[PDB]
């Protein structure tokens, strides 16, 4: 994630003919402390993952830190920054690490007293499959200023915000997202499967 | 809503034999400013309404104000207090008013600049079907201290929190809630309908 957003794609990515541009880019703007983003990601994550796998979409994630403050031990910014650290090593590891932070067992309550510290974030990055420069990147706070400026850069102050090809998308169910994507990329292999299993989780 | 919770039931309420106690009480602990509660209510509301209509559950709502602050113009507490004002007049009006505040067109962004003032809340109460003592109840801040103390009283500091017969319920989809309720009250008229239409919204 170079680059304000971390882009997640598979080798099956369906592109616009005559280009290397994805036909459908779903943009997600999220805060790791936001309980609404937690609900969204736990509900939609598998379906988005499947849309990526079959090549139907590129999934771009911009981890903002709008909830960050001393009162939450800077969890919003440290987690977002950690995700960008992880993405530097491996896109696949970012995928697991991003899913991990929004999982019910890990995401901290917004107004609670306990939040993963930097050592815990590094440990979760390790579990996601990467070390490399992550521990230094996290401990040094390499991406703190970056993530703290992201909300202003993309004009997002409510999360999760989703766009489909740049246009605001009023999401509802994962099955409806599959339907929306199919209107753009068509009946590509795996999409009806993605729809049917989205209707059942 | 007497009473920490506003209880919503229909005349079809299935009760424990030898008692006037509902066989299934679903307890909801919510903050009107909480975006997660907005997502939950928009996704689950119709299904809960149907469970109430067919008599499968009593739905008890405790409107906490954990997000309240001057930075949001006290929207959390004023809205919760308004809902209790509305409930004093009519349970049906509370149902509509509660659904109205969580609707996508009305619920304010948590970190935004604009929030319904007391005049707007009174106007929404009117649209929900009631006047009576509501304008005075709201303008006087009759229930502000009450709602500001609710979170501590029920020990809830994360919303939405749901309990089924007093036991914490890790909610997922409205169809799963129907399944859970059916385990308690059985195959009462309308419940399979509620399940099937829950699987489709
Ligand atoms: Cl990779
Ligand atoms: Cl009534």
Author numbering:
A (entry chain A), B (entry chain A): 56 to 256
Task: Provide text from the study.
In this study, we have determined the 1.9 Å-resolution structure of the soluble form of Mt-DsbA (residues 46–255). The structure of Mt-DsbA was solved to 1.9 Å resolution, with two molecules in the asymmetric unit, and the final model had an Rwork/Rfree (%) of 20.2/23.8. Within the asymmetric unit, residues 56–255 from monomer A and residues 49–255 from monomer B were built into the electron density map while the remaining N-terminal residues were presumed to be disordered as there was no observable density. Each Mt-DsbA monomer comprises two domains, a TRX domain (residues 56–82 and 129–255) and an inserted α-helical domain (residues 83–128), reminiscent of the overall fold of Ec-DsbA. The TRX domain contains the canonical CXXC motif and consists of a four-stranded mixed β-sheet (β1-4) decorated with four α-helices (α1 and α6-8). The α-helical domain inserted between β3 and α6 of the TRX domain comprises four α-helices (α2-5), and is stabilized by a structural disulfide bond between helices α2 and α5 (Cys140 and Cys192 with a Sγ - Sγ distance of 2.1 Å), despite 100 mM DTT in the crystallization condition. The CXXC active site cysteines, adopt a right-handed hook conformation at the N-terminal of helix α1 where the solvent exposed Cys89 and solvent buried Cys92 are reduced with a distance of 3.7 Å between the two Sγ atoms. The Mt-DsbA cis-Pro loop (Thr214-Pro215-Thr216), a conserved feature within the redox-active TRX family, interacts with the CXXC motif through Thr214, which hydrogen bonds to both Cys89 and Cys92. The electrostatic molecular surface representation of Mt-DsbA reveals a shallow hydrophobic pocket at the CXXC active site surrounded by negatively charged patches. To determine whether Mt-DsbA has isomerase activity, we tested Mt-DsbA catalyzed recovery of active RNaseA from oxidized, disulfide-scrambled RNaseA (scRNaseA).
Bacterial Disulfide bond forming (Dsb) proteins facilitate proper folding and disulfide bond formation of periplasmic and secreted proteins. The M. tuberculosis proteome contains another predicted membrane-tethered Dsb protein, Mt-DsbA, which is encoded by an essential gene. Interestingly, an exhaustive transposon mutagenesis study showed that the genes encoding Mt-VKOR and Mt-DsbA are essential for optimal Mtb growth, whereas Mt-DsbE and Mt-DsbF are not, implying that Mt-DsbA is an essential Mtb protein. However Mt-DsbA possesses disulfide bond isomerase activity as confirmed by its ability to catalyze the refolding of scrambled ribonuclease A (scRNaseA) whereas Mt-DsbE and Mt-DsbF do not. This study represents the structural and functional characterization of an essential Mtb Dsb protein, Mt-DsbA, and suggests that Mt-DsbA likely acts on a distinct protein substrate set as compared to Mt-DsbE and Mt-DsbF due to their functional differences.
